[PDB]
Amino acid sequence: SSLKGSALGKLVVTSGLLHSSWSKILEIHNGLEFQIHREEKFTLVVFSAFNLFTSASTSLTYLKSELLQTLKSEKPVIITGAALGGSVASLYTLWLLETIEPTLKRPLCITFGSPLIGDASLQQILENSVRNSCFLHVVSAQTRIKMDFFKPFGTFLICFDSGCVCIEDHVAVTELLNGVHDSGLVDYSQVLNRLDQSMLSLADSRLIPEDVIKGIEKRAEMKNLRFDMMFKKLNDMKISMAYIEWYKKKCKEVKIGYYDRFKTQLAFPSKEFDINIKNHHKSELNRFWKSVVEEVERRPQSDASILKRRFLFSGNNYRRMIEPLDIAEYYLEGRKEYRTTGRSHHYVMLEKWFGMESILIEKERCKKRDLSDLLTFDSCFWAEVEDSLIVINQLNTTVGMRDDVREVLTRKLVEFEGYVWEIITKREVSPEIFLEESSFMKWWKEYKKIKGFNSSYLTEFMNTRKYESYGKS
């Protein structure tokens, strides 16, 4: 509400950041200005427009290394500046936030009325991100910003004749700054003195009208209920995944895998059940997990972009179980190179988020366990198999080939079978690939004729009928 913003403004004005910041900035004032001022409580430096930032690239890198070394000591560093110094400091901290880890002390930039022109495309990436929490803009009541294509980003501390209130919404900041920009710049020292006098005062009026707070309040409930409605939809997404699990379990009874069954019923729709599996129990999960990945990437649920383990632990299984069904639809259209060009973004994001924390775990494996229900750790495995087929047929259909393309295709087949034996030895692939009507056995039958005189231990393992013992007790 308005009184909450007033209480936040009172807290930050009695905390004493703005007075010291303005005093240090004006003392540095009394091009590019670099400060190496170090304090016992926290470091405060003043950096006081693309050409000016690009000219000091080496100095910017040196200062970023120094700031990283300082934040390694768990000390907060704040960068402030003048009108143009504010934009310079904002650009510097926006460039440095990518290298700064969220788990460490996040750099906070404090600007006093810096006019910057940033299009809505740049505001869209940091709409609800924590980056808006880094930048704090304090502007006068009479002073405004004339922006048509530029969009305000970050919290805006608007001061009035009595007190100051913080605005955390971009729409409200744009509505308040709808007027033209004021050329005259008042002294921020008098503004700070008036803010201190108002904080000493017992009563403070509300300058924000009801039309301003109404939209903010009504957007609050929706932006707060999206979180909990996703939290509650996780549960029926689990039920959809259980439906898919039972479908796969029933498909296992027939001597054919679920990937090949999906691939063959996508072209010949029938039986009225695979249609529901494809259109009902698959689109819901895809949409929900895409939305969850987007929301977590935009605003983190915890420090260091750590979503709740309940979410990522289930997303890993979701990816490892659903990605082959998308590979089937991708390769059935005729497209190739799925692992590089055709792979989605949220799959890679989930893979990276699981690999980050997959080192701290104390997992250990034993060979005696049954692997019948084990999921393939490399979800793109099938994405390779089909590719190898595209090579195999290419060796048989086209007659009159140059021998060099034959050699590179043979090298591709060799590296593919090497990767296959590598993932088989480590026991990281599902035993449903050795089924009678599975695609892997078809690939092996097509490759046995081309191999001929060349032999490897994989060929001996396949010919000796030892693939039946794999994945079993």
Binding site: K250, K271, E272, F273, H280, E284
Partner: protein, 397 residues
């Protein structure tokens, strides 16, 4: 055993159970086919026949399993599934064995690859005769003049099948049953034969691929109901119901369906490739029910729904693709029930504030969304039901 259990049942129930043996053995049939057959052949009401089905299921004569969360509505019995056991079907077929082929009302004809049965040569006075064709059948059979046939059941198994010629000899046939139980969409031709029969009322087509506009070329007035299940796509004066279900290649609905004025229930169910609807559907006069269930690719509904004057029941369902509703529904005064289960992406327009006396059936989140306009709307009987996650869809696997 079987005969005493059959005699203990009601006479009409026993006759219906005996006629239920026309279907192929160890097959999975939906209840709509049997319901329509018993309605058109016997003439009894649909509700009492559904009650007879429930009674036979209570006696364990036939097995009835539902496949849809929706309750038993009026005229909608396609989700339900009715299977018979092999022993019960054999016991039902064993009855009336002493009667001749022409003397018995119910007859079963089994065809070979190239040979034909001896009864196909001579005339049969049976009202119910079913012909089962294998994949190797080339539609070669002896001619028969059997005008007493009132029900015809076909079990197709070939990719290219030709309709028999003696269909033109039939006079008072009331329902036609064509069910392709093969592995590929069957191709049919020679439709003008059915154009000669002037008493056909309900036509059913399952897993047969034919061109859409060949049906209006028949120009049949007696036709009243048309059903199309799993079919890869002034002539119709009395056609009242068109059921298009589980059609996968249906990108757009044909234009001849819109021109007819006698449709009252246009059901589009499990058609996941149709995202757009023509405007001509608003030119329809007396559409009572407009079902669009489970068509999870239907983006938004045409404006022409404003022209639907007598749209009483709008059975919307788990249509995930639905994202927008027409700007003016309040012009539909006769509207009574609206179901918005699992489809919340569409935003309730302002017109919902105008229309009153609505019995809305939704889920928890959709019910809470509709409760925002609860003080505004009058006596909106918002009902929140339960979803029972069953595993009965693994029979039609």
């Amino acid at each position: 055993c079987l005969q005493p259990s059959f005699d203990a049942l009601d006479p009409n129930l026993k006759e219906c159970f005996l006629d239920m043996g026309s279907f192929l053995e160890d097959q999975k049939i939906r209840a709509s086919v049997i319901i329509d057959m018993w309605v058109e052949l016997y003439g009894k009401g649909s509700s009492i026949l559904y009650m007879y089905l429930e009674d036979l299921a209570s006696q364990n004569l036939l097995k009835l399993v539902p496949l849809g969360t929706n309750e038993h509505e009026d005229g909608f019995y396609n989700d339900f599934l009715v299977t018979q056991h092999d022993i019960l079907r054999e016991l039902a077929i064993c009855q009336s064995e002493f009667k001749e082929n022409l003397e018995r009302k119910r007859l079963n004809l089994e065809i070979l690859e190239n040979t034909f049965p001896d009864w196909c040569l001579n005339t049969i006075n049976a009202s119910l005769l079913s012909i089962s064709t294998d994949d190797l059948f080339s539609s070669k059979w002896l001619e028969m003049d059997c005008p007493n046939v009132e029900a015809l059941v076909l079990n197709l198994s070939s990719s290219d099948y030709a309709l028999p010629s003696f269909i033109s000899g039939m006079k008072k046939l009331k329902v036609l049953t064509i069910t392709n139980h093969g592995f590929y969409p069957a191709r049919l031709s020679n439709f003008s034969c059915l154009s000669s029969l002037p008493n056909l009322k309900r036509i059913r087509l399952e897993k047969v691929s034919i061109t859409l506009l060949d049906i209006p070329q028949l120009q049949l007035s007696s036709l009243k109901k048309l059903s199309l299940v799993m079919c890869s796509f002034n002539a119709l004066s009395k056609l009242q119901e068109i059921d298009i279900d589980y059609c996968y290649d249906l990108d757009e609905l044909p234009y001849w369906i819109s021109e007819i004025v006698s449709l009252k229930t246009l059901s589009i169910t499990n058609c996941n490739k149709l995202s757009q609807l023509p405007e001509a559907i608003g030119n329809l006069s007396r559409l009572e029910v407009l079902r669009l269930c489970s068509s999870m690719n239907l983006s938004e509904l045409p404006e022409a729904t404003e022209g639907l004057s007598n749209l009483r029941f709008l059975d919307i369902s788990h249509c995930l693709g639905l994202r927008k509703l027409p700007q003016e529904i309040g012009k539909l005064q006769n509207l009574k029930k609206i179901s918005m289960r699992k489809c919340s992406g569409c935003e309730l327009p302002e017109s919902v504030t105008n229309l009153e006396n609505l019995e809305v059936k939704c889920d928890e989140e959709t019910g809470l969304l509709w409760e925002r306009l609860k003080p505004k709307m009058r006596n909106l009987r918002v009902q929140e039901e339960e979803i029972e996650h069953n595993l009965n869809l693994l029979q039609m696997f």
